[PDB]
Amino acid sequence: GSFLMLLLYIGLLLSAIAVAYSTYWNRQLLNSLYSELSVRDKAQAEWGRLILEQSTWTAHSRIESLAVEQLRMRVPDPAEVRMVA
Amino acid sequence: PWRFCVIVGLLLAMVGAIVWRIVDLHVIDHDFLRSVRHIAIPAHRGLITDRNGEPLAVSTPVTTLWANPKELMTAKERWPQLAAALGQDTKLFADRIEQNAEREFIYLVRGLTPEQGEGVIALKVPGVYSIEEFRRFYPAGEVVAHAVGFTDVDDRGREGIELAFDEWLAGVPGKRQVLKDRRGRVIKDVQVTKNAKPGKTLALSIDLRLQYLAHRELRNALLENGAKAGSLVIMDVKTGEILAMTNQPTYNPNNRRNLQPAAMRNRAMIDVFEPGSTVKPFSMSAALASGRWKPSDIVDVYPGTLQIGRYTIRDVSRNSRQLDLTGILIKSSNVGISKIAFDIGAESIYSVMQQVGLGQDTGLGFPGERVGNLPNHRKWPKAETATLAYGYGLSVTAIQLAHAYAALANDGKSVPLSMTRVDRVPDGVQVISPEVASTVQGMLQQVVEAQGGVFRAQVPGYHAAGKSGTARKVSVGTKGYRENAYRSLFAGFAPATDPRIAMVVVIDEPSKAGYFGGLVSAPVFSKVMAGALRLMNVPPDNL
Amino acid sequence: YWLFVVLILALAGLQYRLWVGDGSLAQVRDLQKQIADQHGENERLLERNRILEAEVAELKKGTETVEERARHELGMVKDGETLYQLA
Amino acid sequence: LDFPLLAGCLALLGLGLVMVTSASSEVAAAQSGNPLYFSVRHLIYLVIGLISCGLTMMVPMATWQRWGWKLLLVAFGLLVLVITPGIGREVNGSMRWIGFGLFNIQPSEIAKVCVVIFMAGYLIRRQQSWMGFFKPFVVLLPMAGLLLREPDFGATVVMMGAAAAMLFLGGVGLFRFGLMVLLAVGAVVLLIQTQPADQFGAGYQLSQALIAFGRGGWLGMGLGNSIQKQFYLPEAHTDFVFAVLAEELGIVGALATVALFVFVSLRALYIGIWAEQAKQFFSAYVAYGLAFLWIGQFLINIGVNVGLLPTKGLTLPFLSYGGSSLVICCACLGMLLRIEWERRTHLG
Amino acid sequence: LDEQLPIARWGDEALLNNQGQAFTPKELANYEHLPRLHGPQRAQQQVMQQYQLLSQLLRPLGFSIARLEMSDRGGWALTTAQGVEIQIGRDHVVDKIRRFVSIYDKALKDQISNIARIDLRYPNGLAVAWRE
C-alpha cells in the first residue's frame, strides 16, 4: 500500500500541475481569441464604411437612370422572351 | 519539562492570533474589501440581408468621444477651450460637467466622423479618449424603413425587425479585466474573462428588387391620385414569405430629426379596416364547401335595395336583376351576398374566415402589430350575418388579408407568415378543399378578365386573378364613419393558372379622381404584378 | 489507512477540473477549433471587403461594370439583345 | 521509518510544487520565454533535494559530531564569497546568491544549519558561569553581522529567535537568560543603527494580498484562478506564495496548510522530546533547533503575508521557490528521519 | 526539381502553370496560341484554376478559351476561339456556367455565327447580342 500511496500521490501531483498548465493555456487561448475577434471587428468596420460610401452612388434610381441613358438599356418585353424549359 | 509546555502554548497562541486575523479580514470586511477593474466589451449587431444577397441594415464604425470627469477636474481652465470644439457655451459646458462630476463615464459627442475626432483630441486634454462606436446604417434608406425599422442611440432595437430580433442580432457582450488606477486609467489589459459573441446574420425574405419596384409605383400612385397614404404587401403563396412590403408616407431611417410618428406608422400592421367587398371570395368558398350552392346558380338581386329589419342593404348597382355568383363578385352585389349568407348561414362563413387567418395573429411579432376583430357569436343575428357577408362591421389589416388571399391562391393550404427567409418547404393546414379553391380561382380570373369588372387590373402576358373593394373609413367620436373619406382596396394573385405571387394594395382617402377600388388601385395592381412577375422569373401564359 | 479517502477525493476533484471545468483540455481543444474557424472567416472576410473596395474603386471612375448591377437588379437589356430564360 | 512525519512533509513539498507551478507561469513566460521555467527548475530542485535527503539518511550521525568543523569552514567560505564581488550577483538590492551554473546558491540556510549544529555541540558540553555566557555569542554574532551587512534581515531574525528558544530548551536561567537575550537584541539594534498605497509602483504587495484575502472566500476560487498574480507580483512564487495558495484554495486550504505546518513542526519538536528521553542530547538539541528554525520561518512568512509585520522577502519552507532553501529543508528532513531511526534502534 | 507548366500567360509578361505562380521563361513570343489571362495584382492564385475548371467543364461544348480577364471588382469576362465575349459576372460562376450550358444545348444549338456577346449577368438566364 505504501508504494501504491506513493504512486497515487505522484499521479495527483502530475494531475495538479497539468491543471495549472491547462488553465494558463486556456487564458492564453482566450487572449488570442480576443485578438482575432478584434481583427474581425475592425475588418467589418472597414466593410461597413465601404458599404456606407458605396450606397450613396449605387442607388436604385441612379442606376436605373444610368442604364436607360448611357448604355440605352431598356426593360425587357415579355412578347420577345425565349422561355426555355 | 514545563519549558516544552510554555513554548508549545506560545506557538499555539501566535497561530491562533494569525488565524483570527485572517478570518477577520477575509469574511467580515469582504464587502469593504482602484487595483483591478472588471469591464465589459460591447458586441456588434448582426447583418440584415434580403432574400439572396443584398444587405439591408449594417453597422458602421463611428468615432465617439467620451471623458472621465475625475480626470477632468484638472481642466477647470480648459473647459472653455474644450467647449469650442463641442459647440456649446463654456459656462453651460462647465455646468454640465460639474453636475455629473461624481460620474465616471460621460459621453461628450457621438456620431462624429473620425477626422473631427482627431481634430478635437488634438487639444490632448487629459481624460478624453476616442472609441470606435458602431452606428447602424441602412443601405435601402426609406425604401425598407418600416420593414426593418431602426435601433436607438443605445444600439437597441426600437421598431420593425430591429426590435423584433434584438436577441438574434445584438450578440451578448464580452467580459474583460483591466488594471485601473485612481483616475480610472488602465495600465495593462488583464486576461479576458469572457469573450463577446458575434451577431448572427439574419436573412429577410423580402426581395429588394420587388421592394424598390412596389415603392416606386406606389408613390407614383399617391402622386397621381393625391391621396393621404397607402401601403402594399407582396406574398409568396407556396411559403408565405413577405416578398415585399411598403408603406407611405415613409421616413428616412438614417436621418431621424423631426419625423412625426405617422411617418413611423407601419400601416400594413397597425391600420385596421373593414375589407368591404374584398371578402366575397371567402363567402363563395364557404358556399361551395358546404355543397349546397353551385357556381352556376342564378340569384335574383332585384331591386338591389333589400331590407333587413330596420337596416337597408344598399347595393351599388341596381340595373341588374339576375346575377350568378361570378356576377355577384363582379358587381359586388350586397343583396346577392346577403341572400347567399342567409341561405348558408354565417357559421360556415366565420369558420372559413378564422381558418384562413382573417382577424387573427401570425408568428411575426412586430411592435404595434394589431390583431383586428372578427366577431364570434353563439347565435347569428340577421344584420350581423349580412355585415359579415359583405365585409362591414369588421376589422382586418392588410397583412393577414394578403395571407388569406395567398391561402386562396395556395389551393387552400394556408401557410404561416415568415418575413425571414424560409429554407424548407412548409406544410400548412388545408383550409379549403382543392375543388373549392380551383373554382374560386376561376371566378376571380373571370372577375378580373371579363367585361364590367376591373379592366385596369389586367396584367399583360399574365392571367391575373383579383378582386377590388372599398372601405368607408371609421370616424372617431361620431359612431359610424366619416363623409367623403373612403379607402380603395385591391387584392389578388397571379398567374391564375398556377399562382405564385399574391398582393394587397391599399390607398387611403383618394379625393381627387375617385374612390373606386378598380379605378385607383387596379392600375397599381397591374403594374406591380407586371414587374414582380417579370422579376420572379415565371413563364408568361398570354400572347 | 485513513488518509486514502482525502487523496481519492482530491484526485477526483482535480481530474474533474481537468476534464470538465474551464481549465479542461476539452476547453483547450474547443478554443483551438474556435480560433481556427475564426481565423478562416477573418481571411474570407478580408478577401470579401478587399473585393468590395476594388469594386467601389471602379464604380467612382468607370461605368462599363455598373452594367452588371443594372442588369442583375433590374434584368434590363440593351436594344439589340435577346433574353434567353431558363425555368 | 516515520510514516506520519514523512507524509506531512511530502504533502508540504508537493503542495509547494503545485503552488509554484500555478503562480510562476506568467512571470516565467513573460521575462523568461517558456512559461514552464520556474516550475521545471523547481522540479529538478525537488528531486535533488530528495536525493540529498537520502544521502543524509545514509551518512551516520556521529559525523556531524566530529566532521562539523569543516562544515563551518565551508560555511564561512560561502559567507565570505556572498559578500565579495565577481562571484556574486546583486538582485533586488542584495547580492545574496552565488552562481555555479544553473544552481544559484544562497548560503544563509547552510549557515543556519551549521550554526545550529555547533550550538548543540556546545550546549551538550556547557548546559551548566559567565565564560559560557560569553562563549556562545561568538558563534552567532559574526553570522548576524555578516547577514545584516548584507541586506538580509529575516535570516538574522530567525537566527536570533531560534538560538534564544533552543537555548531556552536545555537549561534556562531566571534573569541571566533575559540578560543574554537583551544583549543580543541590543547588538542587532546597534547593527540596525549602523544601516537604517504604492499600488501604482512596486509596493503593490502591501495591500495586494490584503484585498486578495478580502475577496478570497471560504471555499476559494479553485486552482490557478487568482487575479492578483498575473504580472501583479514579480517573484510571487517566493514571498507571497502563501497568499496565492489562499486565493487558490480558500479558507479551507489556507487553514489546512497552516495546521499542517503546525503539525510537522510540533512533530519535529516532539521527536526532539523523544530524543531527550532517549538520552541523545545532541540529537534532541539539533531537533529542537531545526523545529524552531522552521516555525520561525513559517511564522514570519505568514505574518508578512497577512500584513501584521513589515516587508520581509523570505522564503517559505517546502512551498516557496529556491534551490538552496528546499535542499537545506530536505537535509533537515533527513536529519529528523535519522533522529527517528536512532530512537527506534532500541524499539524495533 | 519541379518544372513549371507553360499553360497560361499573365497579360503579355508572365507565364502561369496549374498552380499559376508567376514564372517567365527564356523565350516569351513562342506561345502565340497559348491563352491570355488577366487579373489584379493579387490574383496569381485563382485565375489559372478557374480557367482550368472552366475549360474542363466546357470541353464537351466544343469551346476552347482564348482570353480570360478579371477586373479588380471580381467580375469575370471570357472570350472564346469563335470570337464572342462572355461576361460571366462577379459570383455564382458555376451556377451561371451550368445555366449557360443548358441554354446553349437547348435553344442555341446551331446559332453560333451571329452573336456579338453573351451576357450571363442575370439571376435567371442570359442576354445575347446579335451581329449582322
Numbering used by the authors:
A (entry chain D): 12 to 96
B (entry chain B): 12 to 44, 51 to 560
C (entry chain E): 7 to 93
D (entry chain A): 20 to 147, 152 to 219, 233 to 384
E (entry chain C): 142 to 273
Task: Show me the paper's own sentences about this structure.
In most bacteria, cell division relies on the synthesis of new cell wall material by the multiprotein divisome complex. Thus, at the core of the divisome are the transglycosylase FtsW, that synthesises peptidoglycan strands from its substrate Lipid II and the transpeptidase FtsI that crosslinks these strands to form a mesh, shaping and protecting the bacterial cell. The FtsQ-FtsB-FtsL trimeric complex interacts with the FtsWI complex and is involved in regulating its enzymatic activities, however, the structure of this pentameric complex is unknown. Since the divisome peptidoglycan synthase is essential for cell division in most bacteria, and is absent in eukaryotic cells entirely, it is a key target of important existing antibiotics and new antibiotic development.
Here, we present the cryo-EM structure of the catalytic divisome core complex FtsWIQBL from Pseudomonas aeruginosa at 3.7 Å resolution. The density for the membrane domain of PaFtsWIQBL reveals 13 transmembrane (TM) helices, including ten helices from FtsW, plus one each from FtsI, FtsB and FtsL. The periplasmic domains of the PaFtsWIQBL complex extend about 70 Å away from the membrane in a “Y”-shape, with the FtsI transpeptidase domain (FtsITP) and the FtsQ β-domain (FtsQβ) located on opposite arms of the Y, and FtsBL connecting them. Taken together, this shows that FtsQ is tethered to FtsWILB via its FtsQβ-FtsB interaction, while FtsQPOTRA and FtsQ™ are flexibly attached in the current complex. FtsL and FtsB have similar folds, each consisting of a long α-helical coiled coil segment, followed by a short α-helix and a β-strand. FtsL and FtsI form an extensive interface in the periplasm, with a total buried surface area of 1035 Å2. Importantly, no direct interaction was observed between the FtsB coiled coil and FtsI. Alignment of both complexes on the FtsW/RodA subunits places PaFtsITP and TtPBP2TP almost opposite to each other, requiring a ~130° rotation of PaFtsITP/TtPBP2TP for their interconversion. Using the cryo-EM structure, the active site of FtsITP does not reach the peptidoglycan layer, but does so in the more extended AF2 model. Thus, the cryo-EM structure and AF2 prediction may represent the inactive and active (catalytic) states of the divisome core complex, respectively.
